[PDB]
Amino acid sequence: TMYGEILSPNYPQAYPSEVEKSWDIEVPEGYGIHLYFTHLDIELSENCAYDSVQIISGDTEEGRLCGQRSSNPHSPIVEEFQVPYNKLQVIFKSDFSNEERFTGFAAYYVATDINECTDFVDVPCSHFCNNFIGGYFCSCPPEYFLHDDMKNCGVN
């Protein structure tokens, strides 16, 4: 998708006790993901060991959140992540009884274009790199032609 919404179970009301829920997010190849939380109302615990919302990018934990926090008066964002990959996983955990009636979280994500020409160490073209939304293409100086590898330019 190019965008989506992720809401904790029962949101905007108190989340269920003793539950674990997972969501997988995927955008097209050629894009990264901007994930932003607009509501965070989770029981606070040391190192968020009990209730929590985790953001995973592989086997790698990108973030782990708990507690209550609000926003910047002109933006509802309370926490956000920008990742260079097109897949991400979010996991929500509620441990024991939710007696204080915490309401969970709300997050949104949007696909972001990867700039293949500038985001990395080397330019993927011998000569001119042209970034566009979803991909990129190489081009050449006048009187040059692009080889079949769609990367290198040559002359006859």
Residue list, annotated binding site for Ca(2+): 43, 51, 95, 113-114, 116, 131-132, 135
Bridge partner list, 3: 110
Q: Among 9, 128, 151, 153, which residue interacts with a copy of itself (rule: CB under 8 A)?
A: 128
Size of the site for a copy of itself (CB under 8 A): 36
Q: Which long-range contacts (CB under 8 A, 24 or more apart) does 141-146 make?
A: none
* Cα–Cα dist 65/54, whole Å: 6
Q: How far is CA 130 from CA 13, 14, 37, 83, 125, in A?
A: 48, 49, 33, 22, 9
Residues at the binding site are 43, 51, 95, 113-114, 116, 131-132, 135
Which one of Ca ion, a copy of itself, Mg ion, none is in contact with 85 (Cβ closer than 5 to 8 A by kind)?
Answer: none
Residues that bind a copy of itself (CB under 8 A): 2-3, 5, 11-12, 31, 38-39, 73-76, 103, 106, 108, 110-113, 117, 123, 125, 127-135, 137, 139, 141-143
